[PDB]
Design an enzyme around this catalytic site. Structure first.
Site, mmCIF file in Angstrom:
data_model
loop_
_atom_site.group_PDB
_atom_site.id
_atom_site.type_symbol
_atom_site.label_atom_id
_atom_site.label_comp_id
_atom_site.label_asym_id
_atom_site.label_seq_id
_atom_site.Cartn_x
_atom_site.Cartn_y
_atom_site.Cartn_z
ATOM 1 N N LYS A 158 -9.917 13.090 -5.151
ATOM 2 C CA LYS A 158 -9.983 12.066 -6.208
ATOM 3 C C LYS A 158 -11.006 12.441 -7.291
ATOM 4 C CE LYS A 158 -8.447 8.431 -3.052
ATOM 5 N NZ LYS A 158 -8.573 7.050 -2.502
ATOM 6 N N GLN A 183 -13.585 3.312 -0.396
ATOM 7 C CA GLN A 183 -12.679 4.051 0.473
ATOM 8 C C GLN A 183 -12.609 3.363 1.848
ATOM 9 O OE1 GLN A 183 -10.896 6.647 -0.781
ATOM 10 N NE2 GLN A 183 -9.930 7.302 1.142
ATOM 11 N N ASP A 190 -7.769 0.147 -7.090
ATOM 12 C CA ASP A 190 -6.859 0.227 -5.924
ATOM 13 C C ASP A 190 -5.793 -0.895 -5.859
ATOM 14 O OD1 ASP A 190 -7.476 2.367 -3.996
ATOM 15 O OD2 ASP A 190 -9.352 1.210 -3.605
HETATM 16 N N1 LIG Z 1 -9.707 2.300 -1.085
HETATM 17 C C1 LIG Z 1 -8.796 3.200 -0.600
HETATM 18 N N2 LIG Z 1 -8.866 3.676 0.676
HETATM 19 C C2 LIG Z 1 -7.879 4.535 1.166
HETATM 20 N N3 LIG Z 1 -7.927 5.059 2.441
HETATM 21 C C3 LIG Z 1 -6.803 4.923 0.336
HETATM 22 N N4 LIG Z 1 -5.891 5.802 0.709
HETATM 23 C C4 LIG Z 1 -5.990 7.257 0.401
HETATM 24 O O1 LIG Z 1 -7.000 7.675 -0.254
HETATM 25 N N5 LIG Z 1 -5.015 8.123 0.817
HETATM 26 C C5 LIG Z 1 -4.911 9.501 0.563
HETATM 27 C C6 LIG Z 1 -4.204 10.291 1.422
HETATM 28 C C7 LIG Z 1 -4.067 11.686 1.192
HETATM 29 C C8 LIG Z 1 -4.637 12.299 0.045
HETATM 30 C C9 LIG Z 1 -4.416 13.829 -0.265
HETATM 31 O O2 LIG Z 1 -5.115 14.289 -1.197
HETATM 32 N N6 LIG Z 1 -3.416 14.531 0.372
HETATM 33 C C10 LIG Z 1 -3.018 15.954 0.157
HETATM 34 C C11 LIG Z 1 -3.911 16.859 1.038
HETATM 35 C C12 LIG Z 1 -3.891 16.539 2.543
HETATM 36 C C13 LIG Z 1 -5.229 16.821 3.280
HETATM 37 O O3 LIG Z 1 -6.298 17.311 2.693
HETATM 38 O O4 LIG Z 1 -5.342 16.545 4.546
HETATM 39 C C14 LIG Z 1 -1.519 16.047 0.512
HETATM 40 O O5 LIG Z 1 -0.921 15.180 1.269
HETATM 41 O O6 LIG Z 1 -0.783 17.016 0.066
HETATM 42 C C15 LIG Z 1 -5.310 11.484 -0.853
HETATM 43 C C16 LIG Z 1 -5.460 10.087 -0.609
HETATM 44 C C17 LIG Z 1 -6.769 4.442 -1.003
HETATM 45 O O7 LIG Z 1 -5.897 4.711 -1.897
HETATM 46 N N7 LIG Z 1 -7.756 3.560 -1.477
#
Ligand SMILES: Nc1nc(N)c(NC(=O)Nc2ccc(C(=O)N[C@@H](CCC(=O)O)C(=O)O)cc2)c(=O)[nH]1
Ligand SMILES: NC(=O)c1ccc[n+]([C@@H]2O[C@H](COP(=O)([O-])OP(=O)(O)OC[C@H]3O[C@@H](n4cnc5c(N)ncnc54)[C@H](O)[C@@H]3O)[C@@H](O)[C@H]2O)c1
Ligand SMILES: NC(=O)c1ccc[n+]([C@@H]2O[C@H](COP(=O)([O-])OP(=O)(O)OC[C@H]3O[C@@H](n4cnc5c(N)ncnc54)[C@H](O)[C@@H]3O)[C@@H](O)[C@H]2O)c1
Ligand SMILES: Nc1nc(N)c(NC(=O)Nc2ccc(C(=O)N[C@@H](CCC(=O)O)C(=O)O)cc2)c(=O)[nH]1
Lengths: 292, 292
Positions: free
Chosen positions: B54, B98, B121
């Site tokens: 992020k 988060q 969010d």
């Molecule tokens: N407040 C708050 N808390 C939360 N827990 C979330 N969810 C929340 O950040 N999810 C999320 C999941 C995966 C990735 C990500 O960058 N995924 C990549 C890399 C995967 C990895 O590094 O394991 C992918 O799927 O390709 C980013 C955010 C949110 O949006 N807001």
């Protein structure tokens, strides 16, 4: 198959008997008698008839009621003024504005002006948000009525297939929200698998979903939308439609056909209508006791 | 059939290029550079990795970011105190906490403390209520991401069958809300026929619904929940699951089987994940311009 015809009038009598007992014990001990205020704008005859059913039901369970009649010509500012006075009056426990309002009035702004603690319709945006998060809230009367018909008849919902025809924010969406959500949350849900359909659902796709359903709930306002060929044998069919056709009242369900295939069916009139009114009385005793 | 494998990384690059242009035109003219504040509590490694993705994405589109690290031992009162200061700071345009938080902290109370105008969010109860009424609102980033994958690929939704596996308040419920609602409302919806399923849906009933679906969206957190026999030929399959199995990352979809039956499929990693991050950047430029 011979469907059991569920009497909403009999079920609502049972609920009103429970509310009267709670009210009369509360007043016997010297607490204030509960009070419901209804604002009715214009001269729509069906609106006047629904509000009469509401104030008569209040009378019979020991709740004081007032109907405030205003002309269709009233301004948004005047109507907001009147709501502020009722919000600040400690004798007034519940407040509701009968819909629909004239075209020049923004209904959303009006619903958001009613104090959330006195919002016995559940239409304020905070009550809507709380309901969609499965938190304690004031639930909208028609969808709570549908829920009580299902539970008091003893029809299971957990793991069952449900189809809702209609997505309106006051009826179809809240019915879908209550029936699909977790039974362990603050406000428990029904744990059913739920399909929502609407004006852009093709009839062929509506049929392919309703034939899988254990419960079909129609809240579309379309006569003969649900017919016997769309229902699996033994299903429960709940008719929330109220349609004036030429000069007669009918529901969304072809009752005479579906009564030969369903296990349970509600009639129109005499089904969900009386249950809407009864659950409004429950919301008013809840607002008066200040437990929410 | 050979499924088109949709690259979430390529789509997110396109969205980030659009956000950078908007930011650099805004700053060139002398307006304040946008600013996003993230509060991160405890030492969960996946949480730390998502927050890094992020803040790097913010860097590359010209948005200033700060990560505030706090120990898992912090009290509810201290965390609320810190949120009040960020809410009152006019340099701060977006604020998010988060999840998940430690067991001793009430997540709902914390989400409701964030100012609704800075709630990038979309988790505050007012933003949830507005979204469920189809009003202008801050949409949750993962569900908006799923929506953009569908729209930018050119997959139709109006009158189509959609199944969502999962009913969580931050992912599955909002996806279902966006895809079933009216295209003519303030915040347009997708006008699809939508089924929601969950932990009490029997596997046999999940299958009978998914074989009708034009689009299947899995947000359950169960490896191999969706397999080739459950999909109709040519369907779009969107994998929102992220599952650590023994030590590997996989989605909810058996990718290797379903790629032989679907028309379109998203991979894990590299699908919805990068789209979550991109749509967060769009919410932050919206908060900074004060147009909502
Ligand atoms: N407040 C708050 N808390 C939360 N827990 C979330 N969810 C929340 O950040 N999810 C999320 C999941 C995966 C990735 C990500 O960058 N995924 C990549 C890399 C995967 C990895 O590094 O394991 C992918 O799927 O390709 C980013 C955010 C949110 O949006 N807001
Ligand atoms: N106590 C009660 O029984 C009670 C209370 C209020 C309303 N109602 C009745 O419920 C019905 C609808 O109420 P409402 O407040 O939702 O009004 P509404 O007219 O806004 O509802 C119409 C809804 O049905 C959907 N729809 C239209 N055509 C359809 C089709 N062919 N297939 C599937 N869905 C379709 C629309 O997309 C919309 O969501 C009306 O008949 C009304 O009289 C009953
Ligand atoms: N950007 C992203 O890709 C992203 C972001 C957040 C979460 N996720 C992923 O989404 C998945 C779930 O996320 P969440 O926030 O909803 O968490 P969650 O664990 O609360 O979601 C579980 C949901 O799936 C349902 N479910 C459980 N078993 C099921 C079954 N057998 N059939 C159908 N439904 C079932 C539950 O009833 C519940 O609603 C996880 O794998 C998580 O890693 C992905
Ligand atoms: N604010 C607000 N506005 C609204 N318009 C509603 N809906 C809202 O009152 N519906 C309704 C419908 C039917 C009856 C009713 O009494 N029906 C009987 C008699 C039918 C008739 O007289 O035509 C029946 O179906 O058996 C009562 C309320 C509401 O709950 N709150």
């Amino acid at each position: 198959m011979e469907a059991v015809v569920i009497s909403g009038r009999k079920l609502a009598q049972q609920i009103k008997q429970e509310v009267r007992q709670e009210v009369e014990e509360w007043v016997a001990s010297g607490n204030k008698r509960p009070h419901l205020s209804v604002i009715l704008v214009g001269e729509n005859p069906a609106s006047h008839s629904y509000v009469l059913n509401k104030t008569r039901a209040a009378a019979v369970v020991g709740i004081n009621s007032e109907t405030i009649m205003k002309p269709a010509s009233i301004s948004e500012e005047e109507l907001l003024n009147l709501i502020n006075k009722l919000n600040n009056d400690d004798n007034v426990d519940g407040l509701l504005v009968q819909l629909p309002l004239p075209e020049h009035i923004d209904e959303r702004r009006i619903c958001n002006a009613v104090s959330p603690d006195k919002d016995v319709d559940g239409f304020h945006v905070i009550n809507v948000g709380r309901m969609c998060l499965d938190q304690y809230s004031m639930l909208p009367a028609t969808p709570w009525g549908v829920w009580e018909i299902i539970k008091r008849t003893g029809i299971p919902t957990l793991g069952k297939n449900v189809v809702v025809a209609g997505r309106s924010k006051n009826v179809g969406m809240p019915i879908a929200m209550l029936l699909h959500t977790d039974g362990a949350h603050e406000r428990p849900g029904g744990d059913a698998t739920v399909t929502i359909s609407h004006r852009y659902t093709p009839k062929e796709q509506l049929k392919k979903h309703t034939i899988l359903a254990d419960i079909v709930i129609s809240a579309a306002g379309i006569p003969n939308l649900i017919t016997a060929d769309m229902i699996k044998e033994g299903a429960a069919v709940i008719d929330v439609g109220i349609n004036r056709v030429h000069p007669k009242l009918v529901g969304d369900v072809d009752f005479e056909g579906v009564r030969q295939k369903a296990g349970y069916i509600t009639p129109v009139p005499g089904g969900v209508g009386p249950m809407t009114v009864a659950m409004l009385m429950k919301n008013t005793i809840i607002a008066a006791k200040k437990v929410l």
